[PDB]
């Protein structure tokens with residue numbers, strides 16, 4: 007589990023969104039595994055605006071933050087889980103790292119701020135849904 011809290015937005019994995027998220031919806035995209043809902047309180051996270059390929063992510067199944075090298079956001083075939091049919095997921099970055107399901111939501115960050123959130127992985131893979139192209143998260 008986990009979310010990004012930027013401005014009056016809450017960014018979560020679409021597959022983990024609550025009824026309150028869907029009732030206060032700003033934007034969602036199944037192909038990216040992302041959903042954004044509105045918040046009453048202002049958040050403290052800042053979004054990175056860059057092309058970094060190194061950063062650190064939080065792994066809840068280890069209680070640890072790990073430094074990683076990750077690929078640029080791409081269209082990747084991901085295997086069937088309980089949440090999606092084997093399909094192509096867009097705007098996804100991969101790194102080598104310990105992952106399990108309930109880790110989705112952990113933040114990946116670089117020197118500029120939050121890069122994305124955990125979404126896919128297994129066999130020492132961890133896939134992050136990028137948010138750096140969502141420039142509108144910084145306004146309104």
Ligand SMILES: Cn1cc2cccc(NC(=O)Cc3cocn3)c2n1
Nearest residue numbers: 087089090105106107125126127128
């Ligand atoms: C971090 N992590 C490890 C996983 C192992 C297996 C499945 C994962 N992801 C999901 O269930 C969510 C999903 C995205 O696209 C399709 N399904 C994993 N995430």
Ligand SMILES: [Zn+2]
Nearest residue numbers: 056058116118
């Ligand atoms: Zn960066």
